[PDB]
């Protein structure tokens, strides 16, 4: 099928230091899958007739100094190019490239080579690997079950080569609690960590089907990042100037709406380019003994 | 100009117990104004060249037991009808009617008579009265200044009769700190109130131009409503079953991002239909001596 190109003028509901851009990306992923896989994702049902949610599982937003999510303001003209890749019947990979409108070569199609091996400073690259799930019991957000809706057309979707498997990426992150190997050269682990008790925010972070909202995981990760930033005695003003050039998230689990989660954060500082840091956040559900999320942010600051 | 009809399938980014639906409504308001007033609202500039924001000022969402914002789930098919009304060059009123797709008479055009005098149980009615503003100083969110972009075409927009003026509605609400007169019969003021210190949430509630995000005022109002609900010894589970059949909001001010706000809430219980309440929330900026928001929610609960 054709990739979907769209002209987008940045709206209030898709930018700022919160989770709105990630929220908008997610809506585009469900639109792109519905179009390319001949399925209404929004109203999807399993063969048995139960609601099946195309759940976010691995999420990457890669930018750079020249274009990062914090670059976007009201009225900016963007080019968005979207398309899906075959991951079988139970999962699907969606990519989005975001360029400034009118920018040289913004009409170019998706290029796996570009996304996984030659990402350009000035374009934003979004990877959404999603897994169809159902609840195992009504009103439980635990122990979700793999699924697929009838008529899900992954067939003919372009193929991903072995090298570019998001499954390798997330499997290492669940084991290491980072997406950037602790043995990666030119970085030094600061000793300062934080651990924040976070009750599920029922006012803010519940979605339309009673799960924790996928974009709320980015909010909870930045809550932990702020906690750690303040512990480094740095200013709220400076927090809002942070440049996030890369962010990876794995959604290991969801959680019941009466849960108390734990947000853990650590940081590694560059020993090679000043102000550049790696922040790792782990979200736990202590009462169930589950790690429900891992995130790593590649940041630049002052 | 033509009113804009659109078929909408409910997405994750526009429903749930949070502020997403209000966020989506606001984006539709800026799209509708851009279309009908021949102006790019998203990138708007005053004649001098400074950014001008079409700021939310009065916001009403009216539903009923048969269709309220909490009715909306992923994949619901809606009909949205949108259009603007002349309020001069510095302000504009936008209306949205939301019906279930296929519902009897969902093709009907906007009807001021219907919105202000004969609202139907089963349709949602949204009123957004917006005022063009600029900052008075860079990086200040206080003392915003009335404005208008060059080429703003309010001319020919359909007219609003004197009876249906939102200015009368908001002027009374800034004076009384409710949209439902304290002398309204069949209600009784409970004695239980709350007052919550709320630092501006820089992780969550900042928009793409560094103001407090308009939808975050609905989040802060429900934070106060939850505080009061818990004081009435009621359950978080019951909070998520609340039905909001009507909500009015006035944005009296914005606030600097280092502000500590105060959220005050009181409730009146019906003495005529059980479980029906009026909740009033006032948001203050004590340090500047300003009331920055008033909201009243007409609720039904168990
Ligand atoms: C659209 C949406 C959304 O997707 N929210 C949910 C965000 N994502 C999640 O909650 C996914 C959480 N992940 C899981 O529940 C599990 O990792 C799951 C995908 C079921 C795989 O389960 P498990 O690791 O036990 O593996 P098995 O399949 O059992 O082997 N929303 O609006 O919030
Ligand atoms: C789109 C958006 C948004 O609109 N956010 C801002 C939400 N709304 C506001 O902040 C409006 C706050 N209101 C005001 O600043 C004032 O009431 C204002 C409209 C300037 C009128 O000022 P004032 O009451 O001092 O009246 P004068 O014109 O001075 O008489 N956003 O994405 O967050």
Question: Experimental method used, please?
Answer: X-ray
Instruction: Return the SS3 of A95.
Output: strand
Query: In the structure encoding, which two tokens stand for residue B84, read together?
Result: 């603007």
Name the percent of chain B in helix, strand, coil, to the closest 5. 25, 35, 40
A65 φ/ψ angles, rounded to the nearest 5 degrees: -45, -40
Query: What is the CB neighbour count within 10 angstroms for residue A196?
Result: 17
Dihedral sign (CA B99, B104, B107, B111): negative
Q: Give which of B87, B80, B79 is closest to B37, Cα–Cα.
A: B87
Question: Quick one: which of B175, B254, B172 has its CA closest to B211?
Answer: B254
Tokens 């990042």 sit on residue: A225
Going by alpha carbons, the residue nearest to atom 29 of ligand 1 is: A145
Structure-token pair, residue A105 = 């070569």
Measured between CA atoms, how close is B122 to chain A, in angstroms? 19
Structural domains in chain B plus CATH codes: 1-302 (3.10.129.10)
Q: What is the Cβ-side half-sphere exposure of residue A230, based on CA atoms within 13 angstroms? A: 12
DSSP characters for A207-250?
-TTSSBPHHHHHHHHHHHHHHHHHHTT--HHHHHH-EEEEEEEE
Which residues have a Cβ under 8 Å from the Cβ of A111 and sit 6 or more positions away?
A: none
Tell if the CB–CB gap between B74 and A43 is shorter than 8 Å: yes
Indicate the residue of A26, A75, A204 with minimum beta-carbon distance to B13. Answer: A26
Contacting residues for A70 by C-beta, under 8 A, at least 6 apart: A17, A242, A243, A244
Q: What is the DSSP code (8-state) at residue B255? A: -
B254 annotated ligand binder? yes
Judging contacts by C-beta atoms under 8 Å, the chain B residues touching residue A42 are 9-11, 74-75
Backbone angles phi, psi at B137, to 5 degrees: -145, 140
> Does A113 contact ligand 1 (Cβ within 6 A)?
no
Q: How far is CA A137 from CA A47, A51, A253, B73, B290, in A?
A: 17, 12, 15, 19, 48
Query: Which tokens go with A228?
Result: 């750690």
Please state, in angstroms and rounded to a whole number, the distance separating the CA atoms of residues B202 and B198. 11
Token pair belonging to B2: 């033509």
Rounded to the nearest whole angstrom, what is the distance from the C-alpha of residue B229 to the centroid of ligand 2?
A: 29
Query: Phi, psi at residue A213, to the nearest 5°?
Result: -70, 135
Residue where the block lists tokens 């991951």: A87
Distance CA B247, CA B88 (A): 25
Would you tell me the crossing angle of helices B20-36 and B214-231 to the nearest 10 degrees?
A: 150
How far from the centroid of its chain's Cα atoms is residue A128's Cα? 7
Identify each DSSP E strand in A23-112 by its residue range: 53-62, 77-86, 91-100
Resolution (angstroms) stands at 1.4
d(CA B140, CA B130): 20
Q: Residues enclosing ligand 2, CB less than 6 A?
A: A 12; B 26, 53, 55-57, 131, 133, 144, 146, 207, 211, 213-214, 251-254
Query: Closest Cα partner for A34 from A145, A136, A130?
Result: A130
**H-type alpha helices, chain B:** 20-36, 112-116, 166-176, 214-231, 236-241
Sign of the C-alpha dihedral computed for residues A265, A270, A276 and A278 taken in this order: negative
For residue B260, what are the β-bridge partners?
A: B199
Residues in chain B: 302
Q: How many other CB atoms are found less than 10 A from the CB of residue B291?
A: 16
A59, containing H or E segment: strand A53-62
Q: What are the backbone dihedrals phi and psi of residue B200, each rounded to the nearest 5 degrees, phi first?
A: -55, 130
Q: What distance in Å separates the CA atoms of residue B229 and residue B107, rounded to the nearest whole number?
A: 39
The neighbouring-strand residues paired with B97 are B81, B125
Residues A284 and A262: beta-carbon distance below 8 Å: yes
Block residue for tokens 């980015």: A218
B/e letters for B12-41, b = 16+ CB within 10 Å, e = fewer, are bbbbbbbbbbbbbbbbbbbbbbbbbbebeb
Measured CA distances, B169 to A56, A174, A216, B113 (Å): 43, 54, 35, 17
- One DSSP character per residue, A144-188 reads -EE---TT---TTSPP--GGG-HHHHHHHHHHHSSSS-TT-SSEE
By the 8 A CB rule, do A48 and A41 touch? no
* Structure tokens that stand for A143 in this block: 């122990």
Distance CA B205, CA B292 (A): 15
Question: What is the DSSP-derived secondary structure letter of residue A256?
Answer: -
Handedness of CA A19, B25, B48, B166 (dihedral sign): negative
Return d(Cα B106, Cα B80) in angstroms, integer.
Answer: 9
């Amino acid at each position: 099928r054709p990739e979907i190109k769209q002209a987008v003028t940045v709206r209030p509901g898709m930018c700022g230091p919160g989770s709105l851009f990630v929220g908008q990306l997610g809506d585009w992923t469900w639109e792109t899958v519905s179009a390319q896989c001949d399925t209404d994702v929004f109203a999807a049902r399993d063969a048995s007739g139960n609601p099946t949610y195309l759940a976010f599982y691995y999420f990457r937003v890669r930018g750079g100094r020249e274009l990062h999510p914090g670059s976007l303001t009201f009225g900016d003209r963007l080019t968005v190019t979207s398309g899906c890749y075959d991951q079988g019947t139970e999962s699907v990979l969606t990519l989005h490239r975001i360029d400034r409108a009118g920018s040289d070569d913004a009409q170019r199609p998706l290029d796996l080579h570009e996304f996984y091996e030659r990402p350009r400073d000035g374009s934003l690259y979004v990877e959404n690997f999603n897994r169809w799930v159902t609840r195992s019991a009504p009103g439980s957000n635990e122990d979700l079950v793999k699924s697929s809706p009838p008529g899900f057309r992954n067939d003919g979707l372009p193929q991903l080569p072995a090298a570019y498997s998001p499954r390798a990426v997330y499997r290492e992150a669940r084991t290491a609690h980072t997406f950037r190997a602790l043995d990666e050269p030119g970085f030094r682990l600061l000793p300062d960590t934080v651990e924040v008790e976070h009750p599920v925010d029922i006012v803010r972070d519940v979605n339309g089907v009673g799960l924790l909202y996928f974009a709320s995981y980015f909010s909870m990760v930045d809550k932990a990042a702020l906690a750690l930033w303040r512990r480094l005695g740095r200013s709220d003003r400076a927090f809002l100037r942070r440049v996030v050039v890369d962010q990876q998230m794995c959604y290991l689990g969801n959680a019941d709406l009466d849960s108390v989660l734990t947000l853990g954060a650590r940081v590694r500082v560059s020993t090679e380019t000043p102000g550049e840091e790696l922040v790792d956040v782990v979200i736990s559900d202590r009462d169930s003994g589950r790690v429900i999320a891992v995130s790593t942010l590649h940041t630049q600051h002052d």
